[PDB]
Amino acid sequence: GVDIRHNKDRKVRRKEPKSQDIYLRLLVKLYRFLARRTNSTFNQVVLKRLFMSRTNRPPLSLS
Amino acid sequence: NPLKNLRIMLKLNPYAKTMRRNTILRQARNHKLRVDKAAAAAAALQAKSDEK
Amino acid sequence: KGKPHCSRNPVLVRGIGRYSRSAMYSRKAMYKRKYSAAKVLATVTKPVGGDKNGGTRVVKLRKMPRYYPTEDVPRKLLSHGKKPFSQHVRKLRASITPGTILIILTGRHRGKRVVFLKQLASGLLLVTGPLVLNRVPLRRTHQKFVIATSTKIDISNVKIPKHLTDAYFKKKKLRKPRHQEGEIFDTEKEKYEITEQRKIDQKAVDSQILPKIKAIPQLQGYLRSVFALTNGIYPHKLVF
Amino acid sequence: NFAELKIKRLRKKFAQKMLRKARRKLIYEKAKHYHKEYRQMYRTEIRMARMARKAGNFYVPAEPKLAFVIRIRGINGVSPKVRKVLQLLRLRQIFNGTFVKLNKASINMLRIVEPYIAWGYPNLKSVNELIYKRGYGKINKKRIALTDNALIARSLGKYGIICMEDLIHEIYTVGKRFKEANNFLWPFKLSSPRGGMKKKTTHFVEGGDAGNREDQINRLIRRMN
RNA sequence: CCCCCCCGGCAGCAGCACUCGCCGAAUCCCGGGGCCGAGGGAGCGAGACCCGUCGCCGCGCUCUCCCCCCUCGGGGGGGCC
RNA sequence: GAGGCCACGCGCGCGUCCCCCGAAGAGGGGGACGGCGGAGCGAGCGCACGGGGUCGGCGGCGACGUCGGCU
RNA sequence: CCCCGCGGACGCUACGCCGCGACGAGUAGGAGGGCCGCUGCGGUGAGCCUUGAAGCCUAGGGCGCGGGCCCGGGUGGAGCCG
Ligand SMILES: [Mg+2]
Ligand SMILES: [Mg+2]
Ligand SMILES: [Mg+2]
Ligand SMILES: [Mg+2]
Ligand SMILES: [Mg+2]
Ligand SMILES: [Mg+2]
Ligand SMILES: [Mg+2]
Ligand SMILES: [Mg+2]
Ligand SMILES: [Mg+2]
């Protein structure tokens, strides 16, 4: 036996969109490739935002 | 395992070959000296007993 | 090109040479042997012959496959060892020297005492407890399945024939050409036949081993008898 | 441009081979230098003790600065303070081992977990046996076996440690970068002590196995891995 | 028999006359028994084609020339400034 | 001056140190070290304690009696 | 400028495939997955079926960690399943 604690082993985060929108899934595929095959941290942030729920993607006003 | 596999040890520590070679050469030299020294003692023991 | 040389680095332990890198550099005279700077026809042209057939034909060798299986197996990785059996080093126990009396533990010659002659190329021992003594011909045996006794005869300066090799003693088979389904019994030739050559070789070796056996008293009686375990005796207390 | 690109690849491959050749010669010579250092330290303690005895005095050796700590009790029913300190020593399992740099702060930690550990002062051989047979690196949070020198150099080369010998030298002679080199090593997963223990529930000085056995930890280590 | 000598000499030396230790950068060689064989396209090269005998690592010989010792060209050695 | 070790081995020029004569202790003639200086390339066989097993080893037996089937 | 060869395995249901490392007790309770199962509806299988459906029986053959499922034999006699 090992003296460790297993309550935080599984990190709770979005690994994919919960949506079934096939157009969202296609450009998730595109940004999954660009995040992996580039060093751009911009593509990483955009990819994880594509996974997010609607409440985590609030609208942006023009102003 | 190193310490059991010679080439694996030489991959991690190339100087282990010359230490091992020096040890094997040294131990053979020391063993030969102790053998010849002991034979001389027996030869002197035989000479001092059968000197006539 | 130049004539090959010996290693010039004596081995003292397996994997370690006696001389170092710089010592071998000077032994090889690498200071003056310094170098800086300075196929198979797949297709064959053949005269096809015949009028207005063109000149020749560019006939290729190893035509492409006529058929492909629906799926294949990926090739293996590489193992840097695992030599074939013919290239294995053959090890022999120190108690088995030419002329040693051995005890057979398996086979129809179970428990018989035979004379060891030489180790063959496969590591199988060649023995002949002489046929006039215990009915053991020139025959191969495995060193793992014999007991090396202490008694020996000096079979030096005897001439074991050179054709006595592993190929000589390898078993021969008949079945099964020109026959697919068994409706007539193919039990013929099941009688193994002793070749005249095997009898000649048996006589040749035994003619020069037997006088050396008779040289020491009642060894032939020892070779005629078989080994057995009496109820009082235990193999771990026995000196062989 | 086929000829020119072949020349480029040959020059690049030959440059990489020379760099590997030069790095191998450095590794060879550092181990030769470490061997000189080890025997100088070993002979010096003998020499210092001899001149003291010649004058009728006493030569007190330097207090050992390196300890090997082995956890000997299990994970059931452990008090919270002992449980915390064992985690800070990276000993979360029984028969786990870790090198510990000895000072006032670390020794007072060893006193708290005293019934739970057996420790002592490893010699040069014990360090070599531990690193070579059971040495695993914490590389990218993964337990990677130390099978190639490039695994040490990529994680510790910025500290000058680029080979197994450098790692051993830093552990044995507690160097400037002991913390980085020691934390790089995954804590040692040792077997049960072949030949058994005396008594794990009492101190070593009272016939048991717990506590500080001074240099008899090496006898334990030989049976342990 | 014990102690001190004015002082010892020789061998051996934690002894292969099994009295009493701790060790190995001051440590190497060999053997035996048991269990196991997971993986499967490693080719910067020819532009691969018989199934990549490949990478890292440790070596040997040749692209120099003399000798030496056995076999009858083959095998084993000394090197050569 | 009658042994051991070296993971020491191309030149040219530059530097540092040592040696000689030193006719200003100038000026040249020699050794050792160098991490210094603008200019491309070794190949060809093997052996393997070398990124997880193979044999380019073998044997016996098989129809109304036996062979295999941990379920 | 490849060419005496005109040639060169597999793959990548990307909700897929591959690699490495650590770990695995569990009541009350929570969550995920279910190519587990039942009934009915929209689609789809140019699905199955009197040359034998459902159901039932079975010392028959198997698959899955499991829920369960497939196939053989018998009985049955008109429907059934992915
Ligand atoms: Mg566990
Ligand atoms: Mg739990
Ligand atoms: Mg308890
Ligand atoms: Mg035991
Ligand atoms: Mg208690
Ligand atoms: Mg001794
Ligand atoms: Mg396999
Ligand atoms: Mg559980
Ligand atoms: Mg529950």
From Swiss-Prot, chain A:
Keywords per UniProt: Cytoplasm, Diamond-Blackfan anemia, Disease variant, Endoplasmic reticulum, Isopeptide bond, Phosphoprotein, Ribonucleoprotein, Ribosomal protein, Ubl conjugation
GO annotation, biological process: cytoplasmic translation; translation
Main location as per UniProt: cytoplasm
Keyword presence, Ubl conjugation: yes
GO cellular component, one term: nucleolus
Location in or out of the cell: Cytoplasm, Cytosol; Cytoplasm; Rough endoplasmic reticulum
Single GO MF annotation: structural constituent of ribosome
Associated disorder: Diamond-Blackfan anemia 18: A form of Diamond-Blackfan anemia, a congenital non-regenerative hypoplastic anemia that usually presents early in infancy. Diamond-Blackfan anemia is characterized by a moderate to severe macrocytic anemia, erythroblastopenia, and an increased risk of malignancy. 30 to 40% of Diamond-Blackfan anemia patients present with short stature and congenital anomalies, the most frequent being craniofacial (Pierre-Robin syndrome and cleft palate), thumb and urogenital anomalies. DBA18 inheritance is autosomal dominant.
Subunit record text: Component of the large ribosomal subunit.
Protein's job: Component of the large ribosomal subunit. The ribosome is a large ribonucleoprotein complex responsible for the synthesis of proteins in the cell.
Family: Belongs to the eukaryotic ribosomal protein eL18 family.
Descriptive protein name: Large ribosomal subunit protein eL18
Organism: Homo sapiens (Human)
Underlying gene: RPL18
Shown part of the complete sequence: 2 to 64 of 188
From Swiss-Prot, chain B:
Locations listed in the record: Cytoplasm
UniProt cross-link Glycyl lysine isopeptide (Lys-Gly) (interchain with G-Cter in SUMO1), position: 48
Gene name, Swiss-Prot/TrEMBL: RPL4
Protein species of origin: Homo sapiens (Human)
Cross-link annotation Glycyl lysine isopeptide (Lys-Gly) (interchain with G-Cter in SUMO2), location: 11
Family in the record: Belongs to the universal ribosomal protein uL4 family.
Post-translational note: Citrullinated by PADI4.
Function: Component of the large ribosomal subunit. The ribosome is a large ribonucleoprotein complex responsible for the synthesis of proteins in the cell.
Modified residues (N6-acetyllysine): 17, 37, 48
Modified residues (Phosphoserine): 49
Quaternary context: Component of the large ribosomal subunit. May bind IPO9 with low affinity. Interacts with RBM3.
Residues of the full protein shown: 317 to 368 of 427
Name of the protein this chain belongs to: Large ribosomal subunit protein uL4
From Swiss-Prot, chain C:
Residues modified to N6-acetyllysine: 191
Phosphoserine PTM sites in chain numbering: 79
Keywords of this entry: Acetylation, Cytoplasm, Endoplasmic reticulum, Isopeptide bond, Phosphoprotein, Ribonucleoprotein, Ribosomal protein, Ubl conjugation
Species of the source: Homo sapiens (Human)
Single GO term (MF): structural constituent of ribosome
Subcellular location: Cytoplasm, Cytosol; Cytoplasm; Rough endoplasmic reticulum
Quaternary data: Component of the large ribosomal subunit. May bind IPO9 with low affinity.
A GO cellular component annotation in the UniProt record: cytosolic ribosome
A biological process term (GO) from this entry: cytoplasmic translation
This protein's encoding gene: RPL6
Record function comment: Component of the large ribosomal subunit. The ribosome is a large ribonucleoprotein complex responsible for the synthesis of proteins in the cell. (Microbial infection) Specifically binds to domain C of the Tax-responsive enhancer element in the long terminal repeat of HTLV-I.
Keyword Cell division: no
Modification sites for N6-succinyllysine: 46, 159
Name by which UniProt lists this protein: Large ribosomal subunit protein eL6
Family according to the record: Belongs to the eukaryotic ribosomal protein eL6 family.
CDD domains: KOW_RPL6 (cd13156)
UniProtKB/Swiss-Prot annotation, chain D:
Sequence repeats: 8-19, 20-31
Keywords recorded for this protein, A-Z: Acetylation, Cytoplasm, Phosphoprotein, Repeat, Ribonucleoprotein, Ribosomal protein, RNA-binding
CDD domains to which the protein is assigned, alphabetical: Ribosomal_L7_archeal_euk
Ribonucleoprotein in keyword set: yes
Signal peptide residue numbers: none
N6-acetyllysine PTM sites in chain numbering: 101
Positions of the UniProt region annotated as 4 X 12 AA tandem repeats: 1-31
A cellular-component GO term for this protein: focal adhesion
Subunit structure: Component of the large ribosomal subunit. Homodimer. Interacts with DHX33.
Protein name: Large ribosomal subunit protein uL30
Organism: Homo sapiens
Gene symbol of the encoding locus: RPL7
